[PDB]
Amino acid sequence: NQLLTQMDGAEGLDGVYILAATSRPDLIDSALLRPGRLDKSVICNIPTESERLDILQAIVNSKDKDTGQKKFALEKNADLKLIAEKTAGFSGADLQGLCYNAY
Amino acid sequence: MKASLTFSLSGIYAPCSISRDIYLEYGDKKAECLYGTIRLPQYGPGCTPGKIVHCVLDDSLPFCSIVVPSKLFGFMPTQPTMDFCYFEPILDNVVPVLDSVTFLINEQLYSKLMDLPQEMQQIQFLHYKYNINSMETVVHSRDILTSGLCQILNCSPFPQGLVDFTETQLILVNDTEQKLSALKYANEDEEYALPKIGTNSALSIDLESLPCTISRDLLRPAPHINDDNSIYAFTDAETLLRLDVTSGSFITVSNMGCVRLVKLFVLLLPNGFKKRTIYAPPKIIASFPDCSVVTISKSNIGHTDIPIANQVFISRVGGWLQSQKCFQNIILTTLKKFFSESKRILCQNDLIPIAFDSSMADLNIAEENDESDDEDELGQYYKNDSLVWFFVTSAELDCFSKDNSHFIIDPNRTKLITTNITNRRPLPLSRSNLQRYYGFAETFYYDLHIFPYVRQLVNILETSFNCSQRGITLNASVLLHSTTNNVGKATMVRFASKYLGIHLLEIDCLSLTSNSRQLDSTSKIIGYIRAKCENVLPYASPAVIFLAHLDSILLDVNANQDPEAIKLQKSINFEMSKLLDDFTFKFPGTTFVGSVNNIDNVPSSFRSHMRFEILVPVPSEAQRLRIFQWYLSSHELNRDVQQKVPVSYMDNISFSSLSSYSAGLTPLDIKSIVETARMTATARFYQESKKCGWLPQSILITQEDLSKATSKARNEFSVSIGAPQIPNVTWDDIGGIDFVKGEILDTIDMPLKHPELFTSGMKKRSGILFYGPPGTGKTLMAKAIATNFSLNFFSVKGPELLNMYIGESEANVRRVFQKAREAKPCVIFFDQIDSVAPKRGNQGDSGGVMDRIVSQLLAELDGMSTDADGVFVIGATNRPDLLDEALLRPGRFDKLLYLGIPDTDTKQLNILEALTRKFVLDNDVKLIELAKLCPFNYTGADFYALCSDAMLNAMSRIARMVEKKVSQHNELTGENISTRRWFDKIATKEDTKVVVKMEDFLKAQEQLTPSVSRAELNHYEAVRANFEGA
């Protein structure tokens, strides 16, 4: 009841933005979907092979994190970018783990 | 410009005349009907806003001479014609046409004109009867146009301007009440005779003190500067001839004792002061207590009877500022100046007032006099603010005797000699103002009809006086205290002192030269207190001692005491007790009048020996009326300000509106609001001055910004106590609540207003409880209450109360809830009571704190005996079954009002339009179309969501249009640009209203869905069907 109040409908409205995450839409407040509340409910999809392409096209660049030496700066397979489309079933789970295995 | 004045026989509608010479110094052949402007010299604080006048050229008028109609001002040419005025030429004759004018007319001629069905016949009648012609004629807001007949009722918003029926509505009003029989302009009526009006040997008339200052430049005759000074008298009618000796003569008659010669003048023709009177400056009336009917006769004498009195032995009155080292020097120096700068007659048994600015103070000035020429300073800089009386006392007359009234002091043959002091009692204010004559710092005029505590204290002092004038000495004393700060404690004592003609000391304790300092000098401080007091009492008239902030020095025991803390405390109590009681025998009839800020904090001993008690409250609405009536008065604005352009209110101001909207504010806040309004209006004035412009004659206060300033006053209050502010939610920003607004007005408006006829019964409906599904405005109603009514808005946000330690309740809920009793009439808002007050029967483990909160909340809330201080508690809940038996219909919180899903047909429209307030839509897509296109079961705030995301897609449309237009720009000019330069070099104003045409509504209807489904509604509809157990 405190959290359902302080930010909304009083001094406290002013300019604060709020960005949540959940495990479930069940165990969360019925005060969803009000303009005075958390409301937009942005979609996160099931990542396909196309999202595999997207993820590998990100993995291939630790972009400008120490521009003088990229993570995996020196690699084979300059041909066959998207080296791991085979992972299409992985759901993208923590591929930093596979990246550390590769390392 | 200076100009000479003359009054014509008057057509009223007939023009004034412009002289050829002014039509050469400001000659303009394109504008032969030169519209002049004149300032009329008058009695009063300053020259009232000048008149624009329509005029005809005349070559016959002597140099700078000008003529205006007499009866246009209600005066007649039988009365003394004033010979001068001031003139201003209107720049390029620039004048606005009036937006509206209203006229009042007698019912006979009103009906005779309204019998004509063709309005143009009345328009020609304006010409045939009144010779009015458009664009030629200028008209003025309230002027009576013929006695018993036509009058202008208002010009608006301007007081003056041009007229044309092509824009001027010419509103007419019927005098059904015949008040035009009384509202006749004629300031003179012919008397039945001049003989038999008394006898020239003896007239008797009430004297009065002239309500204003007057000065040598306004008078018609030409006295000298060095002699003839200071002393003058003013007369009203053919009375000037009943004395046989005209205006400009001396007379000397007095009701008792010695004669007192004075120069008598006719009043200037433009005078507002009541006739059948003889007016005088305070100087004369000061010698003549009561006896207001004065003996009058010719009493003339052949110039000055005595040319010398070779020494004079003057004496000062006792009184507060007349006995201090820091004033002594300025007192003597101003005395020397005053007596040196002019020659005067003086007499034993007479008083001389002296006035000076106490700001001059600890500035000596080294060289201006005695080693320097006689005329020395422009008092324009060497101002005045405070006033003193010197008694003329003995004088050394020659062989001549008895005719002492002519004693005079040659500056070389004579000297003035101090005799230390004398005792005399000042005038009663009821008969005469000093302050309003000298223009000093004001002392607000109470009236005992409507201020109960004033009636109290005035009666106490009145009896203390008169009982000891009779044989019975009274040791009367009183303490004033208040619950709030800043109520006018000192103002009351001062007012009473003047109203009764009683002397006072004015002392404040805060300015004592030491604190409650640890090393004992309570001796030093109480010694200085008595030693400063005593000095005047050996020659005091009946007087009071007023002590400001006794609470600063009468500290009270126990917080953590040093031994010296005990010694100081007891010493102070003892010495003060002795001092006061001793005074009661040291002098009779001399009254201690204290002031304090926390009556709990005054020590018990003093609290016992004190006599009377008076509690002065925050004022009522009935009192507020008179408060505004004072600080919005002409004199009470004009005093503060240099520029010759005066200020006024518009006569439209609703005193009801101020008095209601200013509820709960203290008098000091009312000053703040009015002076802020004055500022904002002057800022508007100088904004107007940026162009050649219009209305230059005077700024007026107006109802809009005077209303606005209340909001700032309330916020500056709130930042002192109760920091939260609230965003505005005006009444129309909600709708579709008709029954609910009904009951809320039946609870917070009608029982609160009109207690003159509402019985104000011995108990009252305590509050309002809103219950139902979320998103039905039940929060919004509270912000609306906070916006529109004058009520303050304290609140706690749900479980803002509960806190870590055991004993939660005193840590919050007690302090806040009593703070609402401590505040002026104010709501407490609650939300989520179903979280704050669990039903006690659902007992909880782990300390059961819910029982502690609920018990303290009920105890502080309910019963409310002797406690109907407007503490409305109002609030919202989700599901009322979880409320405690706190809800059980004792009327402690139980005004249940439901809110729910609207009626299908048009209340959704009322919702959409209300949320469309200050929204914009500008096509044939009427809101009916939207309200029909939306399907039902969408409800409440979900329609605000529908507008919200429609607006979002509308701004998205505008954003992508901007993206296109900026791309097409960057392709052609400004090849390296992005943002700030772009926006600062575009100048859109057609697009910037960014109105949605349509389509955003349709895709909102596609994208939105009801936020609570019927399967969710059923869970609320169950508790709805409980009807809280019915």
Ligand SMILES: Nc1ncnc2c1ncn2[C@@H]1O[C@H](COP(=O)(O)OP(=O)(O)OP(=O)(O)O)[C@@H](O)[C@H]1O
């Ligand atoms: N009813 C009133 N009419 C005119 N002026 C008022 C009124 N009430 C207050 N004032 C103004 O407010 C001030 C009142 O001063 P006063 O000594 O009475 O009280 P205070 O200084 O506000 O309070 P306290 O002595 O409790 O600290 C003056 O400036 C006075 O002009």
Ligand SMILES: Nc1ncnc2c1ncn2[C@@H]1O[C@H](COP(=O)(O)OP(=O)(O)OP(=O)(O)O)[C@@H](O)[C@H]1O
């Ligand atoms: N006239 C109106 N009628 C109904 N709703 C309105 C009206 N005007 C505005 N609203 C919307 O209703 C909202 C407030 O609804 P309400 O107070 O019932 O719900 P809430 O504050 O989200 O929840 P809760 O009442 O549970 O605290 C406003 O913020 C606004 O979006």
Ligand SMILES: [Mg+2]
């Ligand atoms: Mg005060």
Ligand SMILES: [Mg+2]
């Ligand atoms: Mg709400």
